[PDB]
Amino acid sequence: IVGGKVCPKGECPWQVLLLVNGAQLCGGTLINTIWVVSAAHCFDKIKNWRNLIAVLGEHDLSEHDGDEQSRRVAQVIIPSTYVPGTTNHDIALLRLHQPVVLTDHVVPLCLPERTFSERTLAFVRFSLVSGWGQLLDRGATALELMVLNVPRLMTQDCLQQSRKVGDSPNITEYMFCAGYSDGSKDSCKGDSGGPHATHYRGTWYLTGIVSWGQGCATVGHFGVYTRVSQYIEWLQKLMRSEPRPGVLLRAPFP
Amino acid sequence: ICVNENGGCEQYCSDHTGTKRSCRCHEGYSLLADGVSCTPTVEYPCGKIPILEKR
Numbered sequence: 680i681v682g683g684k685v686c687p688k689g690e691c692p693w694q695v696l697l698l699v700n701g702a703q704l705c706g707g708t709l710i711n712t713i714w715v716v717s718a719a720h721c722f723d724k725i726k727n728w729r730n731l732i733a734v735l736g737e738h739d740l741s742e743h744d745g746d747e748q749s750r751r752v753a754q755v756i757i758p759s760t761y762v763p764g765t766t767n768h769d770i771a772l773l774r775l776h777q778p779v780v781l782t783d784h785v786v787p788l789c790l791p792e793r794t795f796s797e798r799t800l801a802f803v804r805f806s807l808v809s810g811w812g813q814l815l816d817r818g819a820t821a822l823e824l825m826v827l828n829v830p831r832l833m834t835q836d837c838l839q840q841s842r843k844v845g846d847s848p849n850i851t852e853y854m855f856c857a858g859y860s861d862g863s864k865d866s867c868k869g870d871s872g873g874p875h876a877t878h879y880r881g882t883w884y885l886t887g888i889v890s891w892g893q894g895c896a897t898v899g900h901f902g903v904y905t906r907v908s909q910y911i912e913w914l915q916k917l918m919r920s921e922p923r924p925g926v927l928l929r930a931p932f933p
Numbered sequence: 934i935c936v937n938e939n940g941g942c943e944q945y946c947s948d949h950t951g952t953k954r955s956c957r958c959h960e961g962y963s964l965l966a967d968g969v970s971c972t973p974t975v976e977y978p979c980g981k982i983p984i985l986e987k988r
C-alpha cells in the first residue's frame with residue numbers, strides 16, 4: 680500500500696495473508712469460516728501447492744501475539760476463463776483445510792448479492808484497500824497491515840483519464856478502476872488478492888480484489904480491481920459444493 | 934422499488950409482482966419488524982468490526 684496508514688489492529692479482521700513455504704505471497708479476504716477470495720494471478724508460479732498457508736488475525740509480521748490463526752489451503756479454485764500470465768478474470772476461491780475460529784480479530788467480510796452489489800454498492804464512492812505489500816513502487820513491503828481509502832471510477836472516466844500510454848491494456852467488464860491519478864496513493868505489489876471493501880449502512884462488503892495497474896501510484900493511472908459482482912453466482916455455487924481431490928481446480932465460468 | 938435507494942432495505946432487496954417489496958439479510962442477521970433493518974443473530978456477523986462495535 681502506497682500513501683495509506685497502519686490499519687489499527689483488528690480493524691481489517693477479514694484480511695488474509697497468504698504464505699508459500701512461510702514467505703509472503705499475496706493477500707486474501709475471508710468471506711466465511713472456511714472460504715477465502717484472492718487473485719488468480721497469485722497462483723501462476725506455485726509448484727509447492729501443499730505448503731500454501733492462509734493466516735487470519737495477522738497484524739504485525741515481526742511478532743506473534745496469539746491472535747493469528749494459520750490454516751493450510753486445501754483447494755484453489757480458478758475460473759476457466761482466467762489465462763495464466765494475464766490480468767482478466769483475476770479471482771480465486773480458496774477452501775481452508777479446517778475453519779478459522781471467529782474472534783474479535785478474525786471476522787468475515789460479507790460477500791454481497793449480485794443485484795445489491797451492482798445497483799447499490801457500485802455507487803458507494805470510497806472503499807478500503809489493504810495489505811502488507813510494497814510501501815513504494817520498487818520499495819520494501821510493510822511489517823504492519825496498511826489500509827487506504829480509494830474512490831471508484833466509471834471505466835470510461837478511467838480510460839479517458841488514464842493517458843494514451845503504449846500497450847495500455849483493456850479494462851474489461853470484469854474489472855474496475857479505483858484510486859488517484861496524482862501519484863500519491865494506490866495499492867501495490869504484495870497487496871494482490873487483498874480486499875476492496877465497501878461500507879453500506881453499517882456493514883462492509885466485498886466489491887473488489889487488488890489485481891493490477893501500471894506501476895504503483897503512477898501519474899495518470901489508477902489501481903485496477905477484479906469486479907467481484909460478476910462472480911457472486913460462480914462463488915456461491917462452488918461454496919455449496921463438495922470438495923474434489925487435487926489442490927488446483929479450474930471451474931467453468933459463467 | 935429495489936432500483937430506487939435499495940427499496941429502503943438495509944441489506945438485500947427483492948421486487949415482487951405489483952408494488953410488493955421484500956427486504957432480506959445476509960446469514961447471521963434477522964430482519965426487524967420494520968421490514969427493512971437487519972440485526973445480528975450471531976456473535977461475529979459478517980462485515981462488522983468487533984473492536985469498533987464494542988467501543
Ligand SMILES: N=C(N)c1ccc2c(c1)[C@@H](c1ccccc1)C[C@@H](c1cc(N)cc(-c3ccccc3C(=O)O)c1)N2
Nearest residue numbers: 720866867868869870871890891892893894895902903
Ligand atoms: N497499481 C496497483 N494497484 C497494482 C496492484 C497489484 C499489482 C500491480 C499493480 C502490478 C504492477 C505492475 C508494475 C509494477 C508494480 C505493480 C503487478 C501485479 C502483479 C502481477 C503478477 N503476475 C505478479 C505480481 C507479484 C510479483 C511479485 C510479488 C508480488 C506480486 C503480487 O501478486 O502482488 C504482481 N499486481
Ligand SMILES: [Ca+2]
Nearest residue numbers: 739742743744
Ligand atoms: Ca503477528
